[model samples]
Target: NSKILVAYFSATGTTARAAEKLGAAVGGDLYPIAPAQPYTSADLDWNNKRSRSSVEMNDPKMRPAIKSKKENIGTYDVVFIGYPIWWDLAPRIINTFIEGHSLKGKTVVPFATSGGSSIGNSATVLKKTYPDLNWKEGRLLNRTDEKAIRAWLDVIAVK
Candidate 1:
């Protein structure tokens, strides 16, 4: 549909899987957000507080570089921004995307996947970050839950 685009950033493929199901359910284009310096196995080590992702999550001011940009963002009526939750929120790189693109009149649907974290304040925090974008309460999909994914899609389809 002209109104939808499923854009996602996935580190371990969990978020990508969810985004794929979402794309199929909603009949939207799938766009993957890749970081400039891809995260290696070592960079994801949460045990070390100094790990790249860990440090970035701890500092709100840090904006990780992105490898590619979304083209023609203004064409979509509704954008589904998917990512892996980092430290209870969307990664700072997501902020970079919002800053780089103008989502002024489009509805932004935020979807995320985490090890065990709830959606918590991530959506609220995102709203504060990009006040100009129309935001919707997002659904947190467990990577393996097909039923939950289908249910959420059904809800948004009717909206």
Candidate 2:
């Protein structure tokens, strides 16, 4: 029997709201990919090159610290990782997540909420970051409802 888990990083509320609904629809647990240092408004100013997000994203080796690691993540067979696209990629904190986990054999699906750009190279980057992990096709699910998400899950056989 396979269990589902919805893990997400939300700067504002878009990704968080989607994750909650995804979890409910799939009968999965929710894990917030929270940063150890919560992002301040100034830190999120993408326009400001000196902002924390800009500096972190600019540096390839950056790994923004995550607050907590989900306990016994190995218990879940299918893991859906959701995030708001930052600079066309997952935040450095997500890299922290990849480094912190022992996610062997889990079917990982990435979902993103982006305003303009699609999923872009986030999935590609993630696969590159952790070549050992099993990755499925990623989805850009902006404002998609439970029904549509369920249909996507059916296509992927996640539920």
Candidate 3:
């Protein structure tokens, strides 16, 4: 069987909702990339230049600690990485998750939720940064449904 893993980091629950629908659509195991120290409302303030999120995003090497590790991650053939777009890119914690796990030889798919940004820039950066990952074209999942999730899966030929 081609096992699937829907692993996501959701800061404001928007990406979490999309991850749920995507997990159901693909019959994949769901994994939350929760932070060790969760983001507070104030910490997520993009307007504040000195906020925690702003500080992290400003530094390219920042890797916010993950709450827990994904068990048996090697067993999954298809891995869907989901996150929200921050400043036209994936959050620094995404680097935390990717570096923490061994996704070698797995079919990696990236999906995102953004206020207005496309998944293009984030996905491109990930691909370039992690050239070893078998990356497929990603989608922006804002306002997406189960049907749309499945349709995207088809477009990526993930299953």
Best by lDDT: 3
lDDT of 2 by residue, 1-159 (tens): 479888899999888988888888888899999898899999999999999999989998998888889988989998889998999999888788878877789999898898877885898999888888888886787878888887887888776
Best by TM-score: 3
Global Cα lDDT for candidate 2? 0.87
How high a TM-score does candidate 3 get?
Answer: 0.97
| Displacement of the residue 57 alpha carbon in candidate 2, Å | 0.7
Cα lDDT tens digits, model 1, 39-124, are 98888888989899899888988888888888878788888898888888998888877777788888888998998887758888
Candidate 1 stretches with Cα past 4 Å from truth are 143-159
TM-score of each: 0.89, 0.95, 0.97
- Using TM-score as the yardstick, the better of models 1 and 2 is 2
The residue-by-residue lDDT of candidate 3 on 8-126, one tens digit each, is 99988999998998898888999999999999999999999999989988999999999899989999999999999999899999999999999999999999999999999999999
Ranking by TM-score: 3, 2, 1
Cα error of candidate 3 at position 46, Å:
0.6
**Clash pairs for candidate 3:** none
Clash statistics: count for each candidate: 1, 0, 0
Pairwise lDDT winner, candidates 1 and 2: 2
